[PDB]
Design a protein around this ligand. Structure first.
Ligand SMILES: Nc1ncnc2c1ncn2[C@@H]1O[C@H](COP(=O)(O)OP(=O)(O)O)[C@@H](O)[C@H]1O
Lengths: 441, 59
C-alpha cells in the first residue's frame, strides 16, 4: 500500500558515522562513495547547526554515479523536522505566474517556523447522552462518559449540543472533545457495546477504552514555512491556493511584513526559525534569468541551503549562446562549492546489486551475480538493476525458485542495453527517421 | 428585621470536596467532585456511611 519498491527505496540515511565523520563503507544503503559522502556529512552537520546562510553546494558528477542517492540519504537523515524540498528544475517554467516568482516561492517553502502551544482534550467512552429536545430545542443535556479510571457527568451548552447532534455521538463512541474549539473526532467504537450497533458493516473495527485520566493537556508542535504564511495572507480564504496552485504574483510588501513579524516573534520568544534544505535537481535546466536571481536570493538571513546536481560538461547556458562548465555561468560558479563524484569499482557494483537484490527479495546464485556484475561493468547500474526485476519474473515464468544464468541471459537477450540500442540505430539508418528519409524495404 | 440576608445568582467555581484542590468533574454513583484518579479510587472504595458525610459537610 503506497510503498511500492522504487529506485531509491533501499536508502535509509546517509550511512556515515556521526562522531568522527568516517564514511563506513556499507551502512544504511549508501555503499562505496567515500569522499562525496564525507563532504555531504559536513554539509549535513552544518545544516542542523543553523548558524550559516543559504549557501550552495553543487553535486557534480557523471550519470548514474549516485547523486540523487546522496540527496535522498540527506533527506532520510533529517526526519520530519527540518524541511527538505525537492525541486526538479522544470516546475519553475509555469504559466499561472512568472518564473522568478515561482523560484522565490520555492525559496520561501524551506524556512520553517516552529511554534509549540497547548490544547486541552478529553478521551473516553460515552456511557450515555440525554438531550432535552422536548416543541423544544437544543437547550440542555447531560453527558455521562468514562475512561478505564475516571467517570464523569457534564452539562452542555447550546453550541455543544449543536455539535453533539452534528457528529451524532452514540452511547459507546470513543470521542475527543477538543475543549477550546468544540470539534469531535470519534477515534473509534468501544468493543463492549458491540451488540448496540446495528447500522454498521459486518466487518467493523472496535477499540478499547482509553487508559489514564480524562482531561489532559497536549503540547503539539507545529512547523509551517514562510510560503505558507504568504499564501494564507493573500486572499480572503487563500490557503486553498497552496493546495490548488491558483496563487498568482504575491505582492512583495506582504513578504516584507511577514519577514518583519517572524523576527518580532523570534525576539519575543514566541517562535523559532528552522532553516531547511532546497534540492534543485538538474540545475542545468535553468536559464541565466534564474541564476541572476539565485545569486541574490542566497544573500539574505532567511535563505535555505541549496543543494544541486549537474550532469553536463562544457555545455551551453539556456537563454544565451555561450558555453560554460556544468551548464552554469561563472559568476554563479563563484558562489557554489562543488563536490565531484567518481565511477564505481566492480566490487562496489556487485554489492550495490546485492543491496538492490535484497531490497526486492529476489534470490540469486553467485554465478548469476557474477554475470550481472559483468553486465553492469559494461552497461551501467540502471540496466542491471532492471535486469534483476526482469530476471525474477522470468524465473517465475517456468516455476523456479532462484534466478540463474539461464534467466539473466534471457533478460539480456530481450531488453537491450543502450549501447546496443545506439548500435541498432547506427546499423538501421535508412528506415529509422533520422531527419528526412523513410525507406520501406 | 432579620430578613436582610441576601442570596446570590452567579456562576460558582466548584472545587473538590475530598481534598481542597480545584476539581472539574463529578460522579453518577455518589455525586462527589474529585481531582484525579487517586481520589476517584478512594471515593469508589470508601466504607459506607461517609459518602453522605462529604455532602453533609458541603451541604
Ligand atoms: N552509494 C550507493 N549505494 C547504493 N545505491 C547506489 C549508490 N549510488 C548509486 N546507487 C544506485 O544507482 C542508481 C543511480 O543513482 P542516481 O543518483 O539516481 O544517478 P544520477 O546521479 O545519474 O541521478 C540509483 O538508483 C541508486 O539506487
Amino acid at each position: 500500500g503506497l510503498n511500492l519498491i522504487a529506485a531509491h527505496s533501499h536508502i535509509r540515511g546517509l550511512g556515515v558515522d556521526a562522531d568522527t565523520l568516517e564514511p563506513r563503507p556499507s551502512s544504511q544503503g549508501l555503499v562505496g562513495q567515500e569522499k562525496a559522502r564525507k563532504a555531504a556529512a559536513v554539509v549535513l552537520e552544518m545544516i542542523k547547526q543553523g548558524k550559516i546562510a543559504g549557501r550552495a553546494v553543487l553535486i557534480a558528477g557523471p550519470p548514474s554515479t549516485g547523486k540523487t542517492a546522496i540527496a535522498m540519504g540527506m533527506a532520510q537523515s533529517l526526519g520530519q523536522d527540518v524541511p527538505f524540498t525537492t525541486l526538479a528544475a522544470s516546475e519553475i517554467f509555469s504559466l499561472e505566474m512568472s518564473k522568478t516568482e515561482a523560484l522565490t516561492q520555492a525559496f520561501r517553502k524551506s524556512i520553517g517556523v516552529r511554534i509549540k502551544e497547548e490544547s486541552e482534550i478529553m478521551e473516553g467512552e460515552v456511557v450515555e447522552i440525554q438531550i432535552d429536545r422536548s416543541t423544544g430545542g437544543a437547550k440542555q443535556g447531560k453527558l455521562t462518559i468514562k475512561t478505564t479510571d475516571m467517570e464523569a457527568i457534564y452539562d452542555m451548552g447550546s453550541k455543544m449540543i449543536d455539535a453533539m447532534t452534528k457528529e451524532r455521538v452514540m452511547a459507546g463512541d470513543i470521542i475527543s472533545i477538543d475543549k477550546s474549539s468544540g470539534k469531535i473526532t470519534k477515534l473509534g467504537r468501544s468493543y463492549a457495546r458491540s451488540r448496540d450497533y446495528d447500522a454498521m458493516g459486518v466487518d467493523t473495527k472496535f477499540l478499547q477504552c482509553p487508559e489514564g485520566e480524562l482531561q489532559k493537556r497536549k503540547e503539539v508542535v507545529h512547523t509551517v514555512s514562510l510560503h505558507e504564511i504568504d499564501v494564507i495572507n493573500s486572499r480572503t480564504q487563500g490557503f486553498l491556493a497552496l493546495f490548488s496552485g491558483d496563487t498568482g504574483e504575491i505582492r512583495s510588501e506582504i513578504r516584507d511584513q511577514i519577514n518583519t513579524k517572524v523576527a518580532e516573534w523570534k525576539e519575543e520568544g514566541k517562535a523559532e526559525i528552522v532553516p531547511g534544505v532546497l534540492f534543485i535537481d538538474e540545475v542545468h535546466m535553468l536559464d541565466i534569468e534564474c541564476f541572476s536571481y539565485i545569486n541574490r536570493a542566497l544573500e539574505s538571513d532567511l535563505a535555505p541551503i541549496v543543494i544541486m546536481a549537474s550532469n553536463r560538461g562544457v555545455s551551453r547556458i539556456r537563454g544565451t549562446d555561450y558555453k560554460s562548465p556544468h551548464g552554469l555561468p561563472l559568476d554563479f560558479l563563484d558562489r557554489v562549492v562543488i563536490i565531484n563524484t567518481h565511477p564505481y569499482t566492480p566490487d562496489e557494483l556487485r554489492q550495490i546489486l546485492s543491496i538492490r537484490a535484497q531490497e526486492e527479495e529476489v534470490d540469486l546464485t553467485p554465478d548469476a551475480l557474477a554475470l550481472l556484475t559483468k553486465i553492469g561493468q559494461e552497461a551501467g547500474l540502471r540496466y542491471a538493476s532492471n535486469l534483476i526485476t526482469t530476471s525474477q519474473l522470468i524465473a517465475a515464468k517456468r516455476r523456479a525458485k532462484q534466478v540463474g544464468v539461464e534467466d539473466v541471459q534471457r533478460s539480456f537477450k530481450l531488453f537491450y542495453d543502450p549501447a546496443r540500442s545506439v548500435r541498432f540505430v547506427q546499423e538501421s539508418e535508412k528506415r529509422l527517421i533520422g531527419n528526412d528519409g523513410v525507406v520501406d524495404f | 428585621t432579620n430578613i436582610e440576608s441576601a442570596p446570590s445568582l452567579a456562576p460558582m467555581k466548584h472545587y473538590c470536596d475530598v481534598t481542597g484542590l480545584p476539581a472539574p468533574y463529578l460522579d453518577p454513583k455518589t455525586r462527589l467532585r474529585y481531582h484525579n484518579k487517586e481520589i476517584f479510587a478512594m471515593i469508589r472504595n470508601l466504607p459506607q456511611g461517609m459518602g453522605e458525610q462529604f455532602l453533609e459537610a458541603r451541604g
